[PDB]
């Protein structure tokens, strides 16, 4: 929304389906850093139930 | 580089300089907004283009602050043979200057605006509607010399629309006629449209230096709206 | 020895499950409103895919 409202340049004309796809890829990159942390954890020393 | 092409490397360096110049020009060309200045000769568009010459082959290069504008200024009139609407199509806005003072030619102005707004070549592009030479219209309505009822039949049963911006001290009759002439064009602008383009209306006179800033604001709004519906937000 | 964990049958666990179900149903209701109005200007403004 910020880049739409701060385009002193002409119309972006971001053609193709690459708009929604770009949104999803950025979301995936953030969640991807989190998932890397997660997999390193659960593969190296996973948690366990403990009496 | 290879095969000892001595002159070819000089040719490549020449092409490198030329490409550098073209790439530099690309920034200005992409940044510069494009305007199609339509309208009949009586509209007074000569005065407004002179004002653009004052404040930044029928061209117009004017730089409002940090943003450039190019007016192609083709007539696009009923009689003028500048059939170059198909060319120079992807423009930022259309500047439709109208002489609201002359009632007899006002209906022809309606027809020209209808033709422009319904032309499928310019369907996407919006219209910056400059109802110009407005002071003489004020003088005409102030006197009883000429009346809107002479040509436009439905000047009666017309109350000044709500929030039609008053001008302190302006004659209420003149304001009523003014907004009638404006809403008469907005009536055409409403039809045959999915909201793609908006006829930004403005009241202007040949002694107005702020027209450049009005064009700047309308162009910024047009770019904003086009980006907004292009990203599926409006 | 007494076996201690946050249990489903424990009343506090029951309340915690009820709140989770309430949140799930409120989120589903918001999704339903956002879908029955998926073309309204408000839903478009707040990025409807996201």
Can you spell out the DSSP letters for C13-46?
HHHHHHHHHHHHHHHHHHHHHHHHTTTSHHHHHS
Q: Which residue of C has its CA nearest to A19?
A: C49
Q: How many CB atoms lie within 10 A of CB B160?
A: 16
* Contact yes or no for B220/B65 (Cβ under 8 A): no
d(CA B178, CA B224): 29
d(CA B184, CA B167): 20
Q: How far is CA B183 from CA B132, B149, B213, in A?
A: 15, 16, 23
> Which of B35, B196, B225, B227 is most worth mutating to test chain A (most A CB atoms within 10 A of its CB)?
B227
The owner of tokens 């409002």 is: B64
> Which of B65, B92, B223, B233 is most worth mutating to test chain A (most A CB atoms within 10 A of its CB)?
B223
* Contact yes or no for B136/B47 (Cβ under 8 A): no
- Structure resolution, Å: 3.4
Phi/psi-derived region of residue B192, left when phi > 0, alpha when psi is between -120 and 50, beta in every other case = left
Q: How many interface pairs between A and B have CB atoms less than 8 angstroms apart? A: 32
**Partners of residue B63 on adjacent β-strands:** B68
Sign of CA dihedral B181, B187, B192, B195: positive
Question: Which two tokens mark B192?
Answer: 């045959």
């Amino acid at each position: 929304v910020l880049l739409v409202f701060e385009a002193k340049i002409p119309t972006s004309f971001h053609r193709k389906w690459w708009g929604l796809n770009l949104q999803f890829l950025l979301v995936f990159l953030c969640t991807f850093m989190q998932i890397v942390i997660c997999v390193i954890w659960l593969y190296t020393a996973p948690p366990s139930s403990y009496r | 580089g290879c095969t000892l092409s001595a002159e070819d490397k000089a040719a490549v360096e020449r092409s490198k300089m030329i490409e550098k110049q073209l790439q530099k020009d690309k920034q200005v060309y992409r940044a510069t907004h494009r305007l199609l200045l339509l309208g009949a000769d009586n509209s007074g568009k000569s005065t407004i283009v002179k004002q653009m010459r004052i404040l930044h082959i029928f061209e117009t290069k004017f730089q409002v602050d940090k943003v450039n504008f190019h007016m192609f200024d083709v007539g696009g009139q009923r009689d003028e043979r500048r059939k170059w609407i198909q060319c120079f199509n992807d423009v930022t806005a259309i500047i439709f200057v109208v002489d609201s003072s002359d009632y007899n030619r006002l209906q022809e102005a309606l027809n020209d605006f209808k033709s422009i707004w319904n032309n499928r070549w310019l369907r996407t592009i919006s219209v910056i509607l400059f109802l110009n030479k407005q002071d003489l219209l004020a003088e005409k309505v102030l006197a009883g010399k000429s009346k809107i009822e002479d040509y436009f039949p439905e000047f009666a049963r017309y109350t000044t629309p709500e929030d039609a911006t008053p001008e302190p001290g302006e004659d209420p009759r003149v304001t009523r006629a003014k907004y009638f002439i404006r809403d008469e064009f907005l009536r055409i602008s409403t039809a045959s449209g999915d909201g793609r383009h908006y006829c930004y209306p403005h009241f202007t006179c040949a002694v107005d230096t702020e027209n450049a800033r009005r064009i700047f604001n309308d162009c910024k709004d047009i770019i904003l709206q086009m980006n907004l519906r292009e990203y599926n937000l409006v | 020895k007494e076996i201690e964990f946050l249990s489903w049958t424990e009343p506090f666990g029951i309340a915690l499950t009820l709140f989770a179900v309430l949140g799930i149903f409120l989120t589903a209701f918001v999704l339903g409103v956002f879908i029955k109005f998926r073309n309204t200007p408000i839903v478009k403004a707040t990025n409807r895919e996201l």
